[PDB]
C-alpha cells in the first residue's frame, strides 16, 4: 500500500541525531541499519533535547526485540512500541516523524 516513513536505511548514527533534533515531538523516530554492527538494526528516538538510541536485538529464530517482548518483523516491533514505551526511564511512545513535504 504505502511505504513506511520510518525506514532510513544506512544513515550514520550522527545523521539520525541531526534529523531527529529538528523534530518537535517526543517519540519521533526512525529505524536505521547500524554501521558499527553490520546486519543489525537500530532505533533512534527523539526525547527533549536528546536522541535515545536502542539496539534491535534478535533471538535464535531471528525474531526482533528491544527488551522482553519479541516480534516476527521490525514492522510489528515498531507498531507495538507506539502504545508501549520504548524506555524504562521515561514514557516515550513511537510516533511518525513530520516529513519535509
Ligand X SMILES: CNC(=O)C[C@@H](Cc1ccc(OP(=O)(O)O)cc1)C(=O)N[C@@H](CCC(N)=O)C(=O)N[C@@H](CC(N)=O)C(N)=O
Asked whether the beta carbons of 93 and 87 are under 8 A apart, the reply is: no
**Number of helices and strands (H, E) in the chain?**
2, 5
d(CA 28, CA 79): 13
Stretch that binds ligand X, among 3-11, 23-31, 50-58, 75-83 (CB under 6 A): 50-58
Nearer to Cl ion (CB atom), residue 1 or residue 77 = 77
Tell me how far, at minimum, the Cβ of 63 lies from Cl ion, in Å: 18
Q: Does 34 bind ligand X (CB under 6 A)?
A: yes
Among the listed residues 11, 26, 55, 70, the single contact to ligand X using CB under 6 A: 55
Cα 66 to chain centroid, rounded: 10
Asked whether the beta carbons of 52 and 92 are under 8 A apart, the reply is: yes
Q: Does 99 bind ligand X (CB under 6 A)?
A: no
Residues that bind ligand X (CB under 6 A): 13, 34-37, 42, 52-55, 57, 66-67
Amino acid at each position: 500500500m504505502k511505504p513506511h516513513p520510518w525506514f532510513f536505511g544506512k544513515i550514520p548514527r550522527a545523521k539520525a541525531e541531526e534529523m531527529l533534533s529538528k523534530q518537535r515531538h517526543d517519540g519521533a523516530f526512525l529505524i536505521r541499519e547500524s554501521e558499527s554492527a553490520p546486519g543489525d538494526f537500530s532505533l533512534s528516538v527523539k526525547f527533549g533535547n536528546d536522541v535515545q538510541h536502542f539496539k534491535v536485538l534478535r533471538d535464535g529464530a531471528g525474531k526482533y526485540f528491544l527488551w522482553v517482548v519479541k516480534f516476527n518483523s521490525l514492522n510489528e516491533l515498531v507498531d507495538y512500541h507506539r502504545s508501549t514505551s520504548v524506555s524504562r526511564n521515561q514514557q516515550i511512545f513511537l510516533r511518525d516523524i513530520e516529513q519535509v513535504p
